């Protein structure tokens, strides 16, 4: 009974409403819309700026304010679209309700995969790692207070000066921590400000399990020092921004190391971002990739305060008391398999999306309509085509988006049970 226009409108409406309602994790991420709109299938690397607040100056005459801080950009790439390709059988097109249900199932699949991507990003890119042999529980005698520890480590580092922190719990630890699901939805949101605050604790069942690192005795090789640099020359001789998030270090060996591991050099201590005061907490670094059998990359760039070569504008970007020494130990943190809990600041994860470049009505074989989800910030396409093999139509919903873990130092992952 449905005609093509009703098919398109109902499907787009269902996708938008379902994806907006399902994902809480993507809502917490700060959506970023590139100024550039591209007609190319291969998305250009978006270099979006990362802003650290300048200290306010008081007085009538500000001619001498100067102090142009270092401008650093982070790179986000958009992968191939995440799509759901399926057949629209005659049963699904019998009336409005069946079509709504099928499109809702497709949107549930896409939204679940978006949440999975965000959760994997946070777990495998989170720098602030907090561990102890205990397990999360209500009693204070022999259990965690994950919210309290995360709040304390955030306040000590002064990363979230004004805005609130988003805490995410896997269902088991969410139940253990004492949070009740009564009068609550699946994710822990209450069925119902934006300027400030809005500190929320939610339960996300998409948090992965962090496999333990089967690596012991790895020592730093050489003396590595890292300085945040805004520009570098590419092979063409032009100037390209430097992703100052990742710093590659040289180790004795990388055997038993993978993407998800966490490390914490023995002699390196964290610093308050706004005060540069040495903190008692050991500095925690998260690996992103293992380049070779000798080199490895880590999420927070260790920039030592006690660097003579460091410029004052570069010294503003400091999170380490002293650089890597000659024979420091990696001191791997995640020693036991455990489901992770992730927390991050206001702008510690960004969702980047731009409309899919496609030309409509040129090829009469398929009908493609572009839709956007403003609440989540995902741009997508909805396409249908008649297939003679199944004597029905083929439908495809493709979402194009890129998750970027900007400011990985503000993403915290807390995994309990690291007994030995």
């Amino acid at each position: 009974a449905l005609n093509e226009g009703q098919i398109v409108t109902l499907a787009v409406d269902e996708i938008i409403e379902t994806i907006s309602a399902i994902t809480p994790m993507a809502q917490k991420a700060k959506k970023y819309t590139p100024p550039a709109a591209s007609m190319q299938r291969s998305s250009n690397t978006i270099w979006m700026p990362v802003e650290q607040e300048s200290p306010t100056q008081e007085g009538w005459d500000l001619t001498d304010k100067a102090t142009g801080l270092l401008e650093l950009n982070v790179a986000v790439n958009m992968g191939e679209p995440d799509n759901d390709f399926f057949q629209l059988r005659a049963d699904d097109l019998r009336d409005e309700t069946a079509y709504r249900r099928r499109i809702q199932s497709a949107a549930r699949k896409l939204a679940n995969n978006v949440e999975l991507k965000v959760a994997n990003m946070a777990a495998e890119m989170g720098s602030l790692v907090i561990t102890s042999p205990d397990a999360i529980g209500t009693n204070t005698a022999d259990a965690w207070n994950f919210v309290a520890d995360a709040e304390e480590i955030m306040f000590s580092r002064e990363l979230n000066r004004d805005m609130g922190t988003s805490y995410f719990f896997n269902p088991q630890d969410y139940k253990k921590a004492g949070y009740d699901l009564t009068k609550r939805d699946i994710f822990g949101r209450i069925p119902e400000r934006q300027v400030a605050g809005f500190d929320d604790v939610l339960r996300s069942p998409k948090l992965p399990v962090l496999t333990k690192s089967t690596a012991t005795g790895i020592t730093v090789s050489g003396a590595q020092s890292f300085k945040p640099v805004a520009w570098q020359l590419d092979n063409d001789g032009n100037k390209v921004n430097v992703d100052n998030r990742f710093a590659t270090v040289t180790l004795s060996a990388t055997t038993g190391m993978k993407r998800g591991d966490k490390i914490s050099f023995a002699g390196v201590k964290f610093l308050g971002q706004m005060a540069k005061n040495v903190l008692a907490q050991d500095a925690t670094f998260s690996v992103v990739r293992v380049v070779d059998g000798t080199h490895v990359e880590i999420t927070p760039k260790p920039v030592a305060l006690d660097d003579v070569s460091l410029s004052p504008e570069q010294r503003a970007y400091a999170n380490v008391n002293t650089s890597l020494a000659d024979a420091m130990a990696v001191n791997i943190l995640n020693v036991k398999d455990a489901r992770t809990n992730v927390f991050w600041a206001d702008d510690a994860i960004r969702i980047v999306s731009q409309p899919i470049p496609a030309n409509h009505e040129l090829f009469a074989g398929m009908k493609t309509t572009s839709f956007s989800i403003p609440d989540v910030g995902l741009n997508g396409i909805f396409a249908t085509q008649g297939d003679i093999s199944t004597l029905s139509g083929l439908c495809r919903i493709a979402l194009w988006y890129g998750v970027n873990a900007t400011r990985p130092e503000a993403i915290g992952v807390g995994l309990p049970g690291q007994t030995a």
């Binding site: 005609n3 093509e4 226009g5 009703q6 398109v8 409108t9 109902l10 787009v12 409406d13 938008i16 309509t369 839709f371």
Partner: peptide, 30 residues
């Protein structure tokens, strides 16, 4: 009634394939 007229205009909009006015009328419904 207002709701019936809104639903009729919603059906008319969905017949042509316009999603923007469909979403706006749905928002007016809520």
């Amino acid at each position: 009634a207002n709701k019936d007229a809104i639903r009729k205009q919603m059906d008319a909009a969905a017949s042509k394939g316009d999603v923007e006015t469909y979403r706006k009328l749905k928002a007016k419904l809520k």
